[PDB]
Amino acid sequence: DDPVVQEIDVYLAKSLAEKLYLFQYPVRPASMTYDDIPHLSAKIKPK
Amino acid sequence: RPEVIQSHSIFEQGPAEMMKKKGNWDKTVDVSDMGPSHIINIKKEKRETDEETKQILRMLPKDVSVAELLRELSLTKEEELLFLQLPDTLPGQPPTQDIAENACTLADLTEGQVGKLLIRKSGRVQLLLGKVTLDVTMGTACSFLQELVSVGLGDSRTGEMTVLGHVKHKLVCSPDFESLLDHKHR
Amino acid sequence: MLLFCPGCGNGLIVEEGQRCHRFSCNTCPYVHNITRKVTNRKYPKLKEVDDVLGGAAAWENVDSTAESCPKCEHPRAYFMQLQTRSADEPMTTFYKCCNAQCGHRWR
Ligand SMILES: [Zn+2]
Numbered sequence A: 001d002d003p004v005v006q007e008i009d010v011y012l013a014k015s016l017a018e019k020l021y022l023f024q025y026p027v028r029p030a031s032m033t034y035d036d037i038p039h040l041s042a043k044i045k046p047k
Numbered sequence B: 001r002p003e004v005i006q007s008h009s010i011f012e013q014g015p016a017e018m019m020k021k022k023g024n025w026d027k028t029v030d031v032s033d034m035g036p037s038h039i040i041n042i043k044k045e046k047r048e049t050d051e052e053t054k055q056i057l058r059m060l061p062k063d064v065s066v067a068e069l070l071r072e073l074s075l076t077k078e079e080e081l082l083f084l085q086l087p088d089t090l091p092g093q094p095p096t097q098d099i100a101e102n103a104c105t106l107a108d109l110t111e112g113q114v115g116k117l118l119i120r121k122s123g124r125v126q127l128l129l130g131k132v133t134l135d136v137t138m139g140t141a142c143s144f145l146q147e148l149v150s151v152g153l154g155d156s157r158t159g160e161m162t163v164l165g166h167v168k169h170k171l172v173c174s175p176d177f178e179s180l181l182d183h184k185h186r
Numbered sequence C: 001m002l003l004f005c006p007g008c009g010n011g012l013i014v015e016e017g018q019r020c021h022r023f024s025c026n027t028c029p030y031v032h033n034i035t036r037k038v039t040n041r042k043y044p045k046l047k048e049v050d051d052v053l054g055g056a057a058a059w060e061n062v063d064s065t066a067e068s069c070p071k072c073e074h075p076r077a078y079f080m081q082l083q084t085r086s087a088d089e090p091m092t093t094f095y096k097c098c099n100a101q102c103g104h105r106w107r
Helices: B014-025 B065-073 B177-183
Strands: A009-012 A020-029 B083-085 B112-119 B125-129 B132-138 B144-152 B160-166 B170-175 C013-015 C022-024 C031-033
Antiparallel strands (some): A009 B112, A020 B144, B144 B160
């Protein structure tokens, strides 16, 4: 099976290695996003 | 309570059923769109099946990595985010990290080009990575909302938080074990 | 068939407290007043009606045509069919003969 198309390359970015997070809402359909409703307050703990 | 009843079994009319049911359910009062009686069509209730959240209207399909990326590049050419999973240890070694055989992970690698992604005839894919190849396959389908966020601890007192976008798909990378066995016979 | 409140994710109930009924939660104030039709149900359940017409009930169901046996063929068994379980499952038929001292009845 010879290559056909799109021998795309890959690169690693370390700019945000310690800065990216992934949130997910099990109870919310993906079609209904939260961006429309204004956000007010948030808190976090590092450890 | 009646007891003497004459049964009937001779055939009747269908459109009669339809017309009577119409009379019993088609007298709509939907015009009652008062201020307190307004609904946002976006704010409707939901089917439990997230794919079929269409219980009341206004009046996943099989996929493969090669076809998915082909769709991602031909029909549309905008930016997209993907959430992919990697094997426990990459085929590299620590970059003079002073060493137990600690696992080699992307978090401990330098920037720059790292490998190539190949699509071949018949629709199967490998991540050519150095001198080894990792197979790529689709993960479990996703239907709930996922958002990619970057948390900037700008100060020990406070920072800032900005949304980047929402993820849609998953990819899984696994070593090609039988290839390794074939190369290095045992 | 069931619905869930998008605001908090819980089963809702129907209630009337104004000019029109409404689909309402109970832990969050979400209300969706109903104004159109829906066309599906939970498929209710009531038991086996067997002898409500037992024996020779109202003779309004006298019919002309009938099948015949492959062996004997005296003039008394007109035809019959019935149903199995529920709305969307097949309907069975049996053909049964009876004079005395046997146990014949076909399906
Ligand atoms: Zn609730």
